[PDB]
Amino acid sequence: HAALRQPQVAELLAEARRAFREEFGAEPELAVSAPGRVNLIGEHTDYNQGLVLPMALELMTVLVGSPRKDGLVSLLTTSEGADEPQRLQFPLPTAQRSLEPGTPRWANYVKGVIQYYPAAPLPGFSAVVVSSVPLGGGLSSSASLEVATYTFLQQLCPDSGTIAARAQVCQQAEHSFAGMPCGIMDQFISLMGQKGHALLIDCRSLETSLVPLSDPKLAVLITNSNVRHSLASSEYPVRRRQCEEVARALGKESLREVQLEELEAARDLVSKEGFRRARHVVGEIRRTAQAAAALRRGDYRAFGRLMVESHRSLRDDYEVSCPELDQLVEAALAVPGVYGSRMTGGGFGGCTVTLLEASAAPHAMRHIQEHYGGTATFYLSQAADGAKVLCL
Ligand SMILES: O=C1CCCC2=C1C1(CCCCC1)N=C(Nc1nc3ccccc3o1)N2
Ligand SMILES: Cc1c(C(=O)NCC2CCC2)cnn1C
Ligand SMILES: OC[C@H]1O[C@@H](O)[C@H](O)[C@@H](O)[C@H]1O
Numbered sequence: 298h299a300a301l302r303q304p305q306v307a308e309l310l311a312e313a314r315r316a317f318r319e320e321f322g323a324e325p326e327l328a329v330s331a332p333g334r335v336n337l338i339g340e341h342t343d344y345n346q347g348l349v350l351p352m353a354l355e356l357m358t359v360l361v362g363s364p365r366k367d368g369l370v371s372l373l374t375t376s377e378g379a380d381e382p383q384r385l386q387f388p389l390p391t392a393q394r395s396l397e398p399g400t401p402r403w404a405n406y407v408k409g410v411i412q413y414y415p416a417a418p419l420p421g422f423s424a425v426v427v428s429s430v431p432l433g434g435g436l437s438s439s440a441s442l443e444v445a446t447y448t449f450l451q452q453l454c455p456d457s458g459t460i461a462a463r464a465q466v467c468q469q470a471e472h473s474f475a476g477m478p479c480g481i482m483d484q485f486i487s488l489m490g491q492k493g494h495a496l497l498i499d500c501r502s503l504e505t506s507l508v509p510l511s512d513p514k515l516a517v518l519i520t521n522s523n524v525r526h527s528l529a530s531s532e533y534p535v536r537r538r539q540c541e542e543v544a545r546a547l548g549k550e551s552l553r554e555v556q557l558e559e560l561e562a563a564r565d566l567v568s569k570e571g572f573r574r575a576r577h578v579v580g581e582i583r584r585t586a587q588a589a590a591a592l593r594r595g596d597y598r599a600f601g602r603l604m605v606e607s608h609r610s611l612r613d614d615y616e617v618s619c620p621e622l623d624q625l626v627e628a629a630l631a632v633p634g635v636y637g638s639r640m641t642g643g644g645f646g647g648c649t650v651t652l653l654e655a656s657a658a659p660h661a662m663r664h665i666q667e668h669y670g671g672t673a674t675f676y677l678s679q680a681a682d683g684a685k686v687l688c689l
Contacts, residue, residue: 298666299659300675303355304429306330306685312375313361314689317425320373324689325361325425327452331444331684332357333430334437334486335519335650336641337495337592337600338607339585341615343480345540345578346501346553348585350592351482352510352517352680353490356431358441360449361689362424370411372404374426378433379403389421398474403432406439409470410446416456424449431674434521435647439475440483443467447488448684460488461503478534490683497589501553508592510680515597516658518651520629520665521674522621525646533643536574536617543567543575552578577614581607601637601652605630608639617644621671625649628668632661 310328317325332353339349365371371386380401389411390396396408407426411419426445430438447463450456456463467484471477485505486496493511498504510517540552546566549555557579564572584603591599608626612618622640626649629638634657641650653661658677666673 298662298673298675300662300677303676303678306357306359309357309359309427309429310361310687313359313425313427316373316375316427317361317423320425321363321371321423323363326363326689327449328359328361328687328689329445329448329452329685330357330359331441331448331487332490332681333441334483334490335517335648335678336482337517337650337652338588338604338639339581340607340611340641340644341536341617342578342581342585343482343498343500344537345582346551347578347582348589349482349498349500350495350508350585350589351486351498352495353486353683354430354436354519354676354678355681356429356436356676356678357681358426358428358430358438358445360424360426360445362422362449364453365421365423367421369421371421371423372407372426373424374403376403376426376428376432378431389419398476402475403442405474406442406470407446409474410443410450410467412474413466413469414447414450414454414456415458415462415466416454419450419454422449422453431521433525434523435525435642436519437483437487437642439471439477440467440487443470444484444487444684448686452686461485464488477530478537486683488683490681492682493680495592495680501551508589510592512595514655516653516655516677517679518653518658518661519641519676519678520625520649520651521676522625522646522648523672523674524619524621526619529643529645529647532617532645536615539571539574540578543571546571553582555579573614573616577610580610597636597652601635604637604639604650604652611640611644619645621646622649624669625665625673628665629661631668632657632664635661
């Protein structure tokens, strides 16, 4: 129970290209990659036009492939947790006949991005898909597969848009083809990550700022609870609706426009539950601004305190934690050298994120595992690059 090895892109490339040479009988022409993500702080704020502070991970999805001349798409994935079958072929969608979600589920992410890809003419293509992002494990495996697909389609047929327009295609694939009405964060960080930086994203204006996060004395420890309660899927849209009810009641376009003071004075305009949801949201936006300021001046102790307040708010007000994540966090915070820890992503399972002195990392891992009633998985990750292309 040491940290799980993260394969370099080169091992992933070598594996994908071999599988491709075997599967299709020729060398692939193209390779792309897009990372998974951990959100340092700013949870359940993106769809509230809030602030988020994710970083791209050294875990990533790689596509290798070649355009076809017959208008068909032919896919193979090797990812272990992928659902059967591992292969799927389908014709390109047309104005007459669209793609539709189905089986196997892993291909719905690719189909969705193809369906909403904005530029024409898109040729068909053959592609192999491999990934080190744990599938469905809370680090945005699906966003990385969407953005990798998008980054591949740009090579088949360049688009002429902005990065946020690409994120929104990928978000639409997730909404329509995976049935998960996500905000913009995961797609945007997968696109926009830079090595050694976190990305402050303003989800109202779509301004982004690269915040340096690279200090050998510091580490980021990701802990996978390896649990995912069914609520991760069904209660996420419930939270979106509750935030929208509160913004409507207060006559605000979004909770970005609402402050705690304003909220407390309109306490009689919303449900008790709604008040709790919106108090989290307004507070988390302020905490994300404060955390970004702290990171910049190298104030990790303060950054870690804000992380802990974010977890408590998520646990108690937004109510999207779970006993597994809580036990993970309470264990991390008992380790000397740990600045702060909190659940990351949507909640009801998945991962926690911990900011700690680098030297403290193996102690945190032994202790967190021992106080965890389940089986934990660990990643030590630096801030990674976002989507990349390599001609083969
Ligand atoms: O079960 C659901 C529910 C929760 C979110 C989660 C999914 C599935 C569906 C099919 C396989 C298991 C998980 N996978 C995506 N992500 C993803 N599947 C990939 C396949 C190849 C490469 C990259 C990939 O990313 N996320
Ligand atoms: C900038 C970059 C790359 C790259 O040159 N191309 C991406 C494809 C090669 C296989 C995936 C890989 N990893 N990173 C971070
Ligand atoms: O911050 C909570 C997050 O839950 C996700 O993982 C969803 O995909 C994101 O858009 C964001 O809303």
